[PDB]
Amino acid sequence: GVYDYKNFGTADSKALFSDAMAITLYSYHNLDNGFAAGYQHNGFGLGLPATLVTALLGGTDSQGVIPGIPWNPDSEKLALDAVKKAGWTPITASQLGYDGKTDARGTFFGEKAGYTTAQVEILGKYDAQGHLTEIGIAFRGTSGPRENLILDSIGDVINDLLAAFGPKDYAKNYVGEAFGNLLNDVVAFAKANGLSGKDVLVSGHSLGGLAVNSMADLSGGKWGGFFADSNYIAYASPTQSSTDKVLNVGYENDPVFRALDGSTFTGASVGVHDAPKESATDNIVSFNDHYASTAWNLLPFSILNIPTWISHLPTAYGDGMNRIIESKFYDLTSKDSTIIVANLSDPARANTWVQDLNRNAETHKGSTFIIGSDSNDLIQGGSGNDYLEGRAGNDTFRDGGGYNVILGGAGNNTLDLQKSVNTFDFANDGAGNLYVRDANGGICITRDIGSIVTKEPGFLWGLFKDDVTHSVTASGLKVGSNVTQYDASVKGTNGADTLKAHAGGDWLFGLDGNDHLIGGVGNDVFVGGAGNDLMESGGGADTFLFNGAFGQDRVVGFTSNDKLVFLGVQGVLPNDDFRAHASMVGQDTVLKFGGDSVTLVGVALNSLSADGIVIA
């Protein structure tokens, strides 16, 4: 999964990520709530006010409400209730034995000249008996005195801040200078409750993300090393720690994220700075109104240009990346997967296709994940391999080719093929999967798609020209009484079946259980499904399709003109080819994808070509 952390599993890494996000949002106390709501309802016509940038960098005094930055009057209670819902409660100065200042919200402040406006939330998570189990440390970092943010033009201010993070270890030492003493109190409090450093979660966004990286850098040497094994998840940080301890998460198009190399200012800092980084998620796109807009992108992309900061705002972090967490494709992803998150305003959502424009970014590699919203989306996949997820709402999908999985989700969803129904083949396993094969052989596995739209250059069956809507039914694609039949198939059961293809060729759907799929001399498509399936070509140009937790399969009679298709399987890194998954075991080649495997019986690995083994 994209947010895998240390050696935690997929699932435990997700739970950590979701807590980090939650305490991170809490730390801003809904600063951007009204702005985000305005954007959602109206779009980004009016851009972004410099006062929002200065607020994000310098903090606020307080509370409300601030030009032009709409203020949700319930910001405070909303934010507290949200963090509580995620399991967290602010810990009191008294509980920590902390002699210093906390405000009306319970926020802690920085301790040394230059840091005195920095903020941190110290939160506790408790079991059902009221025993503390986890401590959450959410930094809300600030640039220094607020008053400095308007003594020059906002671009000069940003430029100078960036240039000052690296020299004299300013960034590295930030948390030591700001919260050194408080963190000693936290150690004692943790030990008093039987917790160790592994039980502490550290997060934050923006300058708060810079603080996360700082604490990680300091954790080996300060506070007795207590925090060396703590969990660090930083959002939208300009910096990266020198340690291997921080998961730096951010939107590719967020100009703050990764602006510095470690803490070093470079020629890319005020431009596009999308070079890969080991600690960071490098290819998550916020598909928002700015990103989508020709007008907005006339000027070169730069942190110094305030509209670009739209992609830095915290609400879209929490909303968009929570949708990543919830995705049915989540366990297919890895840290540098290309993921496009639908983040359009309501007006833009109506007529803008969410797609990988690859704007202001290095060329993307590997498969592409496009995650929709809970409303009606227009989603367009590319000519490579795509995983498209509609979620709720009536979603419409387009896709440019390749091998793909399209999940309609809730709603009445549509696949728009943009070409004649005559150029495509359709099959259906009876288990909610509708397969769509293009003229070049690319295959889409689709679910919850009720309608197919085709563009007919002639009068399909002498009746319908131009755009034609077909209904997906058990018996075929229907237009009134007209049916486009599915391809010949043989369907099994969820137990162990023997299925035999006819000489003309069949799709063979084993479904669950350990199946015996006997192909014929025709061109068959073998879908063993779950279980450990034995699949015999029987001649012809056959295709063997593997999705999900597909089991330990054996393929017999595989030749050069046959194809393996791995689509929505485990263990695939961007741009893996089959050699990364292949080994020889005696006379057979074995292809492994996480815990699942295909054995190509009596096939020497050196005889295989990548053209015959599609890894998506």
CB of 518 to Zn ion, least distance (A): 5
CB of 535 to Zn ion, least distance (A): 9
Tokens representing 294? 């020709």
197 is in an annotated binding site: no
Q: Is the CB of residue 486 less than 8 Å from the CB of residue 463?
A: no
Name the one range near Zn ion by CB under 5 A: 38-46, 124-132, 216-224, 588-596: 124-132
The β-bridge relationship of strands 434-437 and 443-447 is antiparallel
Q: Where is the chain discontinuous (C–N over 2.5 Å), named by the preceding residue?
A: none
- CA dist 205 and 328 (Å) reads 26
Question: Which residue in 13, 27, 75, 206 is the catalytic one?
Answer: 206
559 is in an annotated binding site: yes
386 is in an annotated binding site: yes
Q: What is the DSSP letter of 132?
A: E
CB of 233 to Zn ion, least distance (A): 25
Q: Does 12 bind Zn ion (CB under 5 A)?
A: no
Q: What is the DSSP letter of 182?
A: H
Out of 129, 351, 440, 481, the residue judged to bind Zn ion by CB under 5 A: 129
Q: Does 127 bind Zn ion (CB under 5 A)?
A: yes
Closer residue to Ca ion, CB minimum distance, 31 or 310:
310
529: partner contacted, choices Ca ion, Zn ion, Pt ion, none (Cβ within 5-8 A by kind): Ca ion
Q: Does 130 bind Zn ion (CB under 5 A)?
A: no
- CA dist 30 and 584 (Å) reads 56
Closer residue to Pt ion, CB minimum distance, 343 or 368:
368
**559 phi and psi, to 5 degrees?**
-125, 175
Closer residue to Zn ion, CB minimum distance, 274 or 515:
515
- CA dist 281 and 249 (Å) reads 5
553 is in an annotated binding site: yes
444: partner contacted, choices Ca ion, Pt ion, Zn ion, none (Cβ within 5-8 A by kind): Pt ion
Q: Does 436 bind Pt ion (CB under 5 A)?
A: yes
For 259, other C-beta atoms within 10 Å of its C-beta total 24
402: partner contacted, choices Ca ion, Zn ion, Pt ion, none (Cβ within 5-8 A by kind): Ca ion
User: Strand, coil or helix: what is 562?
Assistant: coil
Closer residue to Ca ion, CB minimum distance, 69 or 270:
270
Give kind and range of the element (H or E) at residue 173: helix 170-192
- CA dist 47 and 237 (Å) reads 23
- CA dist 260 and 266 (Å) reads 7
CB of 407 to Pt ion, least distance (A): 12
Binding mask 390-409 for Pt ion (x = CB under 5 A): ---------x----------
Taking CA atoms, 263 is separated from 3, 172, 244, 527, in Å, by 23, 8, 15, 51
Count of residues engaged in binding Zn ion, rule: CB under 5 A: 3
Name the one range near Zn ion by CB under 5 A: 61-69, 125-133, 430-438, 474-482: 125-133
436: partner contacted, choices Pt ion, Zn ion, Ca ion, none (Cβ within 5-8 A by kind): Pt ion
512 is in an annotated binding site: yes
Q: What is the DSSP letter of 308?
A: G
Q: Does 131 bind Zn ion (CB under 5 A)?
A: yes
Q: Cα–Cα–Cα angle for 25, 130, 246, nearest 5°?
A: 40
Q: Is the CB of residue 82 less than 8 Å from the CB of residue 23?
A: no
- CA dist 588 and 603 (Å) reads 5
- CA dist 608 and 81 (Å) reads 57
Residues that bind Ca ion (CB under 5 A): 252, 274, 280, 282-283, 336, 361, 372, 377, 381, 386, 390-391, 393, 395, 399, 402, 404, 408-409, 411, 413, 492, 497, 501, 505, 510-511, 513, 515, 519-520, 522, 524, 528-529, 531, 533, 537-538, 540, 542, 550-551, 553, 559, 561-562
Which residue in this structure is represented by tokens 């450990």?
532
372 is in an annotated binding site: no
For 238, other C-beta atoms within 10 Å of its C-beta total 26
Closer residue to Pt ion, CB minimum distance, 419 or 491:
419
Residue with the shortest CB distance to Pt ion? 444
Q: Does 2 bind Pt ion (CB under 5 A)?
A: no
User: Strand, coil or helix: what is 172?
Assistant: helix
409: partner contacted, choices Ca ion, Zn ion, Pt ion, none (Cβ within 5-8 A by kind): Ca ion
Q: Does 498 bind Zn ion (CB under 5 A)?
A: no
Reply yes or no on whether 583 is catalytic: no
CB of 584 to Ca ion, least distance (A): 21
537 is in an annotated binding site: yes
66 forms bridges with which residues in the sheet?
A: 69
404 is in an annotated binding site: yes
Tokens representing 290? 């700015």
Tokens representing 482? 């007209």
For 96, other C-beta atoms within 10 Å of its C-beta total 20
Report the sign of the C-alpha dihedral through residues 460, 465, 466, 468, in that order. negative
510 is in an annotated binding site: yes
Task: Tell me, letter by letter, the H, E, C secondary structure of 385-418.
Answer: CEEEECCCCCCEEEECCCCEEEECCCCCCEEECC
Q: Is the CB of residue 546 less than 8 Å from the CB of residue 403?
A: no
377: partner contacted, choices Zn ion, Ca ion, Pt ion, none (Cβ within 5-8 A by kind): Ca ion
Q: Does 389 bind Pt ion (CB under 5 A)?
A: no
Count of residues engaged in binding Pt ion, rule: CB under 5 A: 3
Q: Does 444 bind Pt ion (CB under 5 A)?
A: yes
Closer residue to Ca ion, CB minimum distance, 143 or 311:
311
CB of 536 to Zn ion, least distance (A): 5
Q: What dihedral do alpha carbons 573, 577, 583, 587 form, nearest 10°?
A: 150
Cα radius of gyration (the chain): 27
Taking CA atoms, 332 is separated from 174, 195, 435, 547, 597, in Å, by 37, 33, 20, 11, 16
- CA dist 209 and 219 (Å) reads 15
| Residues of the shown chain interacting with Zn ion in the complex, contacts defined by CB under 5 A | 127, 129, 131
Binding-site residue positions: 117, 127, 131, 143, 152, 156, 252, 274, 277, 280, 282-283, 336, 373, 375, 377, 382, 384, 386, 390-393, 395, 399, 401, 404, 408, 410, 413, 493, 495, 497, 502, 510-513, 515-516, 520, 522, 524, 528-531, 533, 536-537, 539-540, 542, 550, 553, 559, 561-562
| Residues of the shown chain interacting with Pt ion in the complex, contacts defined by CB under 5 A | 399, 436, 444
Binding-site residue positions for Ca(2+): 117, 143, 152, 156, 252, 274, 277, 280, 282-283, 336, 373, 375, 377, 382, 384, 386, 390-393, 395, 399, 401, 404, 408, 410, 413, 493, 495, 497, 502, 510-513, 515, 520, 522, 524, 528-531, 533, 537, 539-540, 542, 550, 553, 559, 561-562
Catalytic positions: 206
